Symmetry: D2
Subunit: 321 residues, 4 copies
């Protein structure tokens, strides 16, 4: 059942920082992420595109890499100092996980990093060093009507949520909201290191799979404009669920699908979770409002489709059904 | 087939002005319309409540009347001058419709009025005189987060839309948008006297029935707040459809159900239709975007449920299936 | 004092439609109106640019023409039918005003038109025919964060407001709001033909001069984004007054200056004025809130700077001080 | 010159948490803070009112206490754990500052606390324990149009900013933005413990004085509604500055004055400052955009008026001019 708790301290994680996504047609994906969504290109080449949101100063929040199979190559977290990359390496080695360290980084603009196949089969990366680039916070001359301003969280699908939760708590994540039954069993959990509702969340299901990566906008009208632009471009069929308001997290949300089917959440409205005794909100598994505060109808694909993730050799991790 | 065109001129209609609805439990309805939606009470007694929106100066936009069967007693249009009330009476008399004129009005605050059972079975009222009340436009001290600022239109369900359309064009309504097939047959039409997309619209289906009455908010966030409040009050199951953006009319919309099941549309975003040659926008019956610009899933009840309307004796008009 | 009331009927005016502005450097002005403000180019040549707002279907709302002196060449109103152009010509001829008729129009995309040097010295144009162009209402792929969606009104500066008001009332404009003193003398007036607060307004001052031309946005955040973009482009010194809320008209506003100093108002939030007995709101000349609902400080240039207007020969009208 | 750096560690501060202000007429203040601004009353008695913002779970963000002289009695910061209250006491004791520890708290709902007259003359409180109350985040049934959702920061006026800055950096606050001259001298600094731009800021001027306490709204339209409501209530002369956008901090802001003249900032739009190497943004003292991104005119009172602060005996600290 439970992942053992190492005797070495967990690495001090600051926040989720970026995700590396493999796409099958780079030009088609570039059209979606840059021309439709408006993400900012930090740099690109024939095979990879480095994108960042408006208020980011690190090198990128998303890396799109062309590959033969659409999948997620890495969920990356920034750690507090260089020594924490060492700590992350030691922690996972004690758990017996495969680890790979590259002083020069795995993606451009990132420095010394360690990638690991974690206990739940996910490719996690921990890094501290990264090139700083121009922070576009006040470049209102580049601000689009649907501007994505920051990367907020990842959502992972795994078969055993209680095992996943205890493992992430040992890593230092705290639970801001969870869904449990009368028995006290955790069905899903929102976990954070930074002061928003979450950096990652665990959803029960066949896995390991990536459910979605999420960006925030400043206000609700920005999310509506994304829908409107998609309708004008005749790609409204890529709008999967939303807009709506989730009861869990209180987020005003929208889920859309990229060309390979990877799910992107765009939401707005966070609340502060930084206090040491921030109250956990537990939702009952039968409370309808947990999914949708407004009662919007259920979208089946949202519970069944999710992206494959890769092992450190670049091959898909088998999905446990 | 087509209603005959009278030889007397049509009354000069300015805009839709109010609707009289019969509710089965006035206190339960008062809670929804006043405590939940925030409409302003002009006056009320044991059996009837007169409500108005924020920017209205005439006596009321809605009259709620207690009765044994939930239904709509009257669709009321304001005409241009006192003489037009005579015109409306003469016009319908020539069509052979039952008319009833009351110099003192049918509802409080309204003067000389004529009500008719129109050719499609709907109770229409035409009046000019009305008591003026405090226009609350700048009473920001009363402004709620989901404030309804003005009454915009009615939507009617009738079995033969081409007959209804030609009948309303003779009355002087112009078509801003319609849905037609390749054969050029009209399936639905949006018709207006004032300079917005419509004062009334015709939907094909079993009728005569009232599909909805609609109010506008100033901005999109006001509609979102109505949803959030209903979720907090635990009546999100009364949210029927939306929020969404209609392709036809371009409205950002929300449809909710009152305690008796009468459908209220709250929407925002109009466009100007006042020019004499305002282009009619014709949508193809197979274009999915005409219903939802964002492709939101269809909601069955929206196409089957609608409210009964009353004849001039106060009895429901039989529904033609 | 008063302009005589002609014995021939006034032309039936539908709304203000466009303004022809002379600029001294076309490329500099194009940068402002198109690159900064985002207006849509209908067509252009070496000497003139035809622009329209998002929801317009007539050929243009603004014509920028290069010339030696920055000034306003024409305030154009669309009339109800072709016969009304004849009516406009006859009406002004009876007043003894100079008139010039061109069956082929004075600006591209406009047909039979009559221009007149009106009694207050303004170059007014009346036309019906105009080429229709693609209405961009639902082109959300072109929608900018600060999108100007429609042309709403003109504001004119004239030395004798009571004379100007009585003359515009004879033309059929109604007063929605005015500013008067205890004596009952009109200091300024908002006048309309269409169903918003105004198509034109009269401000007392040295004239004839054009105070501003105004465009509406859908919501308040669109106006804030214009400010933000101007700050990022380092041209915030062209923001003259606002954002604020006017007590008169209830508009959330912003006034900015183009390269030649012509004033452009961008506002949002109208209210309906279409009923025949729409109550006039009279503000007292000493009520502070009439200028600014929020008490924002007075901006002196707003009361002294305004654009010159041209006579029908293209020469500036002398300003009466 | 510089405050000495103690040899004991600084207490681990999480965020600014509440301010205790003394008002001269509690009922008049209650009307402003509760009836006008809509803050939520946690509890109150004849002499004191405890208020909290929408998303707060600790007992209060503001304590209003009736007293003979309007002033600020305490700037309170929540620390990470009970042991940190001991740390704060030891730390200030080593600086030679007067401290007062109360196991039972100084205000209701707060536990073990230490208050100090800090080196710059300000009454700072550090506490960990506080009673939790219903977090109203999703009580949309209570949500007003101008809802204040969370307390964000304090702003302090002090004559020697470089001394104050170094003192706060030793306490562990990091600088997100500062204003410096060519000589590299600090004129003002924005300092934070939590992940927003600041928990407190230092403004040069006669002090010690409290410049403002700030609350955030979810969106810009909420701030606009506060202005509109104040204009409707005829207290727009209490709006001191804004709405505007600050270049420093990037906040869309509004400053208003309570009945005793204490300055409240309502703002929205934060950006994330949590990374260990978050880039400090340094603004030049001559850059006009640092104050107002839109170039709004300067408001003199903003630079001269500020609130007195009290010593631990409840007497005003003399202001150094
Ligand atoms: Mn999510
Ligand atoms: Mn409708
Ligand atoms: Mn104006
Ligand atoms: Mn501040």
């Amino acid at each position: 059942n439970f992942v053992p708790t190492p005797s070495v301290p967990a690495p001090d994680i600051v926040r989720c920082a970026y995700m590396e996504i493999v796409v099958t047609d780079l030009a088609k994906s570039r059209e979606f992420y840059v021309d439709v969504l408006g993400l900012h290109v930090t740099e690109e080449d024939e095979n990879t595109i480095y994108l960042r949101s408006l208020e980011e100063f690190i090198h990128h929040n998303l890396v799109l890499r062309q590959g033969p199979i659409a999948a997620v190559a890495a969920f990356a977290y920034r750690v507090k100092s260089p020594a924490e990359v060492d700590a992350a390496e030691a922690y996972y080695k004690e758990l017996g996980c495969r680890t790979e360290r590259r002083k020069e980084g795995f993606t451009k603009g990132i420095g010394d990093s360690v990638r690991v196949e974690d206990p739940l089969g996910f490719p996690y990366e921990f890094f501290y060093e990264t090139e700083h680039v121009e922070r576009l916070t006040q470049r209102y001359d580049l601000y689009s009507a649907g501007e994505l301003v920051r990367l907020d969280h990842f959502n992972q699908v795994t078969p055993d949520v209680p095992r996943g939760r205890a493992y992430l708590e040992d890593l230092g994540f705290r639970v801001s909201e969870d869904i449990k039954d009368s028995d006290g069993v955790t069905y899903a959990a929102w976990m954070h290191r930074k002061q928003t509702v979450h950096d990652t969340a665990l959803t029960g299901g066949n896995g390991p799979r990536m459910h979605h990566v999420a960006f925030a906008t400043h206000e609700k009208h920005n999310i509506i404009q994304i829908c409107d632009k998609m309708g004008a471009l005749r790609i409204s069929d890529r709008i999967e669920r939303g807009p709506g308001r989730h009861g869990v997290s209180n987020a005003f949300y929208l889920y859309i699908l990229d060309p390979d089917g990877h799910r992107i959440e765009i939401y707005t409205q966070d609340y502060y979770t930084g206090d040491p005794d921030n109250p956990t909100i537990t939702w009952d598994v039968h409370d309808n409002q947990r999914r949708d505060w407004w009662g919007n109808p259920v979208v089946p694909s949202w519970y069944t489709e999710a992206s494959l993730v890769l092992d450190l050799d670049g091959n898909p991790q088998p999905v446990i059904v």
